[PDB]
Amino acid sequence: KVFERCELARTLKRLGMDGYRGISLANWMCLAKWESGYNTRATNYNAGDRSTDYGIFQINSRYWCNDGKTPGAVNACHLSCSALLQDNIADDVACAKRVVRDPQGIRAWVAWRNRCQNRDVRQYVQGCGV
């Protein structure tokens, strides 16, 4: 499923992401935009290290979900990577919360640094009623 901006804004709010571990809603929106274009079915194979990024938040199989095929990986979120490809983002949200619970926080996603850090990200939630 490809979310519309405000529709996702509202969904994330309901899911308790606003201010999660100090991370504002607008930041999570910026993240999803740059990682998947708000597409829950998006996947990206990293030939470099043999892992795959899955779903809305492009969660990596090296550490967060199990795909069976990534070498040396762990599955911190206790989920099959398949779970992150559903149209519902409940699993994605619970796993993303897990990711930021580690020291790096939101910085674990390099695109967040490149595209969202130190920028005015209010645009991502403007007019959405959240």
Annotated catalytic residues are 35, 53
Whole-number Å distance between alpha carbons of 82 and 53:
11
Question: Which sign does the torsion angle of CA 12, 10, 29, 54 carry?
Answer: positive
Residues 42/56, Cβ–Cβ less than 8 Å: yes
- The tokens for 87 are 């149209």
- Phi, psi dihedral angles at 46 (to 5 degrees): -105, 100
CA atoms within 13 A on the CB side of 11: 18
Q: Which two tokens stand for residue 43?
A: 């996947």
